[PDB]
Design a protein around this nucleic acid. Structure first.
Ligand SMILES: [K+]
Ligand SMILES: [K+]
Ligand SMILES: [K+]
Ligand SMILES: [K+]
Ligand SMILES: [K+]
Ligand SMILES: [K+]
Ligand SMILES: [K+]
Ligand SMILES: [K+]
Ligand SMILES: [K+]
Ligand SMILES: [K+]
Ligand SMILES: [K+]
Ligand SMILES: [Mg+2]
Ligand SMILES: [Mg+2]
Ligand SMILES: [Mg+2]
Ligand SMILES: [Mg+2]
Ligand SMILES: [Mg+2]
Ligand SMILES: [Mg+2]
Ligand SMILES: [Mg+2]
Ligand SMILES: [Mg+2]
Ligand SMILES: [Mg+2]
Ligand SMILES: [Mg+2]
Ligand SMILES: [Mg+2]
Ligand SMILES: [Mg+2]
Ligand SMILES: [Mg+2]
Ligand SMILES: [Mg+2]
Ligand SMILES: [Mg+2]
Ligand SMILES: [Mg+2]
Ligand SMILES: [Mg+2]
Ligand SMILES: [Mg+2]
Ligand SMILES: [Mg+2]
Ligand SMILES: [Mg+2]
Ligand SMILES: [Mg+2]
Ligand SMILES: [Mg+2]
Ligand SMILES: [Mg+2]
Ligand SMILES: [Mg+2]
Ligand SMILES: [Mg+2]
Lengths: 184, 147, 32, 261, 141
RNA sequence: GAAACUGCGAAUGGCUCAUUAAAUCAGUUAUAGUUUGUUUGAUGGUUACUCGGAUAACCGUAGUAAUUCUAGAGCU
RNA sequence: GUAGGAUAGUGGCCUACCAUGGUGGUGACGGGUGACGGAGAAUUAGGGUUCGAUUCCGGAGAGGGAGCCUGAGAAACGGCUA
RNA sequence: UGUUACUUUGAAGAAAUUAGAGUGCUCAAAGCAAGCCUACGCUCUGUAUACAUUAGCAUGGGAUAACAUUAUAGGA
RNA sequence: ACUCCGCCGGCACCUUAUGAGAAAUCAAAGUUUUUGGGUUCCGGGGGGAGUAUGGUCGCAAGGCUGAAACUUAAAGGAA
RNA sequence: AGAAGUCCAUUGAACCUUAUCAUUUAGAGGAAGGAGAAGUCGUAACAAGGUUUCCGUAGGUGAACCUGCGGAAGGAUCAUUG
């Protein structure tokens, strides 16, 4: 099957390598997951070397995404793949791979923001909410996309390896970089 | 800027969007640029501690450790991107004739942007994990030719 | 690249001449 | 091979076992255990080749399956159990108790012990690090793991382990001036005072040891085992006391023995 | 004269490599042409006697050396094998199995026999020496 | 205590030298670049007086020229 | 080189994109070997020449290829599929 | 702290083979045994040691030799 | 211009062995089993044969590079 | 939960082309070398070998060889201040 050996490669000088042994099981590869965004979740269990387990996600719809500046992580629905640095064909096929830029539902984070800062984007409770409002700062670029209900996010997990699609909300100069790539 | 690829390049684990400031924190914390000492008596160049380049294969700011053999040689080719060919000259002993013959070996090595190198310069390379099909070494020091 | 080598050559040739003036000035003062 | 080798050819067995080359095609393959297969003495060798209690491979099994042999205070029934340096072997029926120590020629010697001295052993500390829940632990070179060790214990130190309480009674820091034994290499079995430690960044650390008679020899840190603080070891040594004699000196003793004996 | 430099190890080694070919003994073993000989590097060989022939002895001798054309069974090559001793040709019949050996000079002709480098050792599984001394008899009749 | 289920082993050993010329291999390294049944040591929180449905051996209807070829039924 | 995919894991191992590099009379590349490598063997004043299929170590194969299940471990052949 | 070769010493280094110590298998090729006295045994019985290119690792030496370097000193 | 003394460089010659060599002979062809200043080319019994083949150069004639099968007990040098 | 079957992709045996290379081998005829007691024709080399021999090159002749041009002594001359 798929093999990760170097025997089929050319030498650094350019000469060929004559085969001196058959393929080994301990140097195999496997078919890519090609995880897609779909509400029909499907993750198949793969037995790997040592009797260990890998989770190969064929279809996913939700992910665990973290708002780094706010230090809050929420499970949210994945809406769309918008950018992929490796292959633009993975964008129109809606493939979920590590480091792909996706849009996630902003609703779970809005609820936390309202519950935490008391703002939309009980005597002892109002005492602390206003206290936390003193040091409240929200990026203009990050707030502008709360109106549409979608947040740009980057997948930080490997769905074909762990079976999950987790990530973090884009912000700072990383958000500026990617939103300029989408400005066409 | 250093952002020239299709993806956004950054150091892993360095959070750049923190409300607090990084003033008074160690490298790689508070959004501060991350760098480290490789040991073995080698100095961290000022160009790596105060630079803005992103190189995950850099020995001082990347994610590669130096362990194994430390070798020296002369820069033979500096035409690849962040990779050079190091020529190592040595003598092979011919037993029957009790004499020597000159031999050489070309060792590919990764060079981080913090180093400036030209053909003929003397370089020291430290072994690291495989970085490509042929590269197993990282440049640790460059001495300009004629110095 | 051209600017990189221009600044180094221009600044090196500056202090390289300043040191020559300073050494000659120091020599003039040592004679007396 | 497609997996693990289960056989040991007799000529490939460690030389310090002193197995005759024509005794058979195979040697006992040491089982997995606290000591490495090249630095151990399987119980079958001890019971049959060293002590002569068993005459054959079969008889060793009979002795062990009666639960008559203990290693480090616990009964062992595995014929190829890897008993190694500082291990205490006890045979209650014969009232015997031995400690595995190297003689000055580098071979394991069954050093008879007193009942009082057979209640502990020395172990070399491999490393100290935090485990799960931030609980510190140390592991030794005989496969043991001790949780909540004294914070002063560091790598390469020696700990005195009580075989009853299974706790660290006392420890010796690794430092120049202590008496050590060599546990590997050319100088295996030699005892001396650690005189110097030469560190080489990225490379092995060399230790210079001086014998009681002024003979100085070097070796790697991994082959050193501290036996006591200062100059007195905490364990009983064999007759040679780690003093390696020249072949000329050894021949001199043999000649004198024939004149007297 | 000879190259003497301490760093001249390569030249001395490569010079000898080229010059060993000038030696006839060296070139005969490393050329690979020995495998094309009728024995193809073997010490002996079996064959079938095609015909019994006589060869005129080379000068200044004068005789008819009794030989036998033999086709080797393993490769089908035809050779001339001398039959030694007096009246031993009478022990050999055509279309008979004979063991052949070299003549003693490693593929070179021997004595006054022109162009003959093989001799007959056995016939029908029996040595000519045994038949000559009446130790054994050929298995037939 | 046969049989049978379950567990483990059969990846060692033995044989051979066809392919293979910086390859194998040798001395020397590295894994801070990984997996590792077993052994050994340590470590695993503040209907329950014990759940459910199957199946082998067995039993008895068999098919095929035929195989540790094979179908259905009754048990546990 | 960058970003991914795959892998027990490193790596053009594979994919997308980008750069134009890499090796070579210090013999690359190709060809020959009646070439498995070594520990060693024969003969040796010294240096050397020749040999090393074979019981120890390493590798490789099970009529030729390829593929794979089970399993901690096999691309297994006194396992399976073509 | 210019970089090397060379040399010295040491560490690490499979066994078997080779050299070699001990030992009267009747000798020998070998083998790794045995020996001592006459008790419920002893000699902690023995199963040494050297060699092991080249490359790599680490101390001492600095003659010989290689490369690098020098005056607008970017000198101390 | 010629005569005498000398120095450096050159083409050579003459005598001689304390040298070398199989000798002829050589002041280098010496300082070589008491064997080592540096470096290039090149030979390994006689033939087949500077032939066949491949490559390369040439308008051609040919040049350069260059085998094997096989054959033979000598061929050859000095005296 | 799930069989047959189906779809796309991957790995990919196997077979069938053209092409190339390798090794072996037939071939009318042409033609080389060598060997084979005691063939035919001359006499070219050895003496100044009866035209001194030889090298390069070119042409010619049954055959060895002959001739032209330049060269060598390994010549049959170390020699004419006559
Ligand atoms: K393996
Ligand atoms: K030679
Ligand atoms: K198994
Ligand atoms: K190796
Ligand atoms: K990988
Ligand atoms: K890459
Ligand atoms: K298993
Ligand atoms: K003169
Ligand atoms: K003539
Ligand atoms: K003449
Ligand atoms: K003419
Ligand atoms: Mg095996
Ligand atoms: Mg280390
Ligand atoms: Mg000379
Ligand atoms: Mg069973
Ligand atoms: Mg080849
Ligand atoms: Mg290599
Ligand atoms: Mg990658
Ligand atoms: Mg591509
Ligand atoms: Mg060989
Ligand atoms: Mg072969
Ligand atoms: Mg072999
Ligand atoms: Mg073979
Ligand atoms: Mg055999
Ligand atoms: Mg083997
Ligand atoms: Mg196999
Ligand atoms: Mg067969
Ligand atoms: Mg198979
Ligand atoms: Mg079989
Ligand atoms: Mg098998
Ligand atoms: Mg003279
Ligand atoms: Mg000489
Ligand atoms: Mg010749
Ligand atoms: Mg004439
Ligand atoms: Mg005439
Ligand atoms: Mg004439």
């Amino acid at each position: 099957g798929i093999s990760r050996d170097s025997m089929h490669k050319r030498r650094a000088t350019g000469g060929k390598k004559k085969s001196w042994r058959k393929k080994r099981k301990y140097e195999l590869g496997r078919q890519p997951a090609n995880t897609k965004i779909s509400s029909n979740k499907t993750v198949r269990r793969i037995r790997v070397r040592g009797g260990n387990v890998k989770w190969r996600a064929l279809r996913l719809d939700t992910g665990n995404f973290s708002w780094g500046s706010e230090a809050v992580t929420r499970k949210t629905r994945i809406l769309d793949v918008v950018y992929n640095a490796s292959n633009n064909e993975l964008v129109r096929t809606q493939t979920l791979v590590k480091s792909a830029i996706v849009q996630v539902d902003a609703a779970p984070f809005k609820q936390w923001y309202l519950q935490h800062y008391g703002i939309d984007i009980s005597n002892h409770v109002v005492r602390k909410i206003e206290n936390r409002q003193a040091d409240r700062k929200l990026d203009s670029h990050l707030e502008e996309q709360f109106a549409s209900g979608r947040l740009l996010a980057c997948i930080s997990s490997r769905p074909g390896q762990c079976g999950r699609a987790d990530g973090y909300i884009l912000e700072g100069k990383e958000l500026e970089f990617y939103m300029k790539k989408l400005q066409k | 800027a250093e952002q020239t690829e299709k993806a956004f390049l950054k150091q892993p684990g360095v959070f750049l969007s923190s409300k607090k400031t990084g003033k008074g924190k160690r490298p790689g914390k508070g959004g501060n640029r991350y760098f480290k000492s490789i040991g073995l008596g080698f100095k961290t160049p000022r160009e790596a501690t105060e630079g803005t380049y992103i190189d995950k294969k850099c020995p001082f700011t990347g994610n590669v450790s130096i362990r194994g053999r430390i070798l020296a040689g002369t820069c033979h080719s500096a035409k690849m991107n962040r990779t050079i060919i190091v020529r190592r000259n040595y003598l092979h002993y011919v037993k029957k004739y009790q004499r020597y013959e000159k031999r050489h070996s070309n060792i590919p090595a990764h060079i981080s942007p913090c180093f400036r190198v030209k053909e003929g310069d003397h370089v020291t390379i430290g072994q690291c994990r495989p970085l490509s099909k042929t590269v197993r070494f990282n440049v640790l020091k460059v001495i300009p030719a004629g110095s | 690249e051209k600017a990189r080598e221009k600044t180094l050559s221009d600044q090196f040739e500056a202090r390289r001449a300043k040191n020559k003036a300073s050494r000659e000035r120091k020599f003039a003062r040592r004679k007396k | 091979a497609r997996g693990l080798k289960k056989h040991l050819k007799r000529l490939n067995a460690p030389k310090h076992w002193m197995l005759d080359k024509l005794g058979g095609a195979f040697a006992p393959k040491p089982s997995s255990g606290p000591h490495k297969s090249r630095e151990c003495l399987p119980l079958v060798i001890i019971l049959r080749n060293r002590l002569k209690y068993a005459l054959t491979y079969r008889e060793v099994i009979s002795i062990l399956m009666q639960r008559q042999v203990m290693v480090d205070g616990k009964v062992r029934t595995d014929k190829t159990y890897p008993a190694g340096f500082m291990d205490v072997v006890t045979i209650p029926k014969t009232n015997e108790s031995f400690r595995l120590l190297y003689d000055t020629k580098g071979r394991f010697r069954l050093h008879s012990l007193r009942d009082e001295e057979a209640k502990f052993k020395l172990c070399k500390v491999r490393s100290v690090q935090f485990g799960q829940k931030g609980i510190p632990y140390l592991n030794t070179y005989d496969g043991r793991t001790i949780r909540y060790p004294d914070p002063l214990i560091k790598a390469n130190d020696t700990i005195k382990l009580d075989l009853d309480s299974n706790k660290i009674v006392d420890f010796i820091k690794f430092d120049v001036g202590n008496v050590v034994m060599v546990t590997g290499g050319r100088n295996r079995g030699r005892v001396g005072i650690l005189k110097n430690r030469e560190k080489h960044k990225g490379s092995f650390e060399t230790v210079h040891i001086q014998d009681s008679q002024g003979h100085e020899f070097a070796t790697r840190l991994g082959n050193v085992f501290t036996l006591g603080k200062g100059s007195k070891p905490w364990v009983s040594l064999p007759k040679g006391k780690g003093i390696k004699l020249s072949i000329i000196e050894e021949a001199r003793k043999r000649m004198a023995a024939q004149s007297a004996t | 004269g000879k190259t003497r430099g301490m760093g001249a190890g390569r030249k001395l080694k490569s010079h000898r490599r080229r010059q060993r070919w000038a030696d006839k003994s060296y070139k005969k073993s490393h050329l690979g042409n020995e495998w094309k000989k009728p024995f193809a590097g073997s010490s002996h060989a079996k064959g079938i006697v095609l015909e019994k022939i006589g060869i005129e002895a080379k000068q200044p001798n004068s005789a008819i050396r009794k030989c036998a054309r033999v086709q080797l069974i393993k490769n089908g090559k035809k050779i001339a094998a001398f039959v030694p001793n007096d009246g031993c040709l009478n022990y050999i019949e055509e279309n008979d199995e004979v063991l052949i050996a070299g003549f003693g000079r490693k593929g070179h002709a021997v004595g006054d026999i022109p162009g003959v480098r093989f001799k007959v050792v056995k016939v029908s599984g029996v040595s000519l020496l045994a038949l000559f001394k009446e130790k054994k008899e050929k298995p037939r009749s």
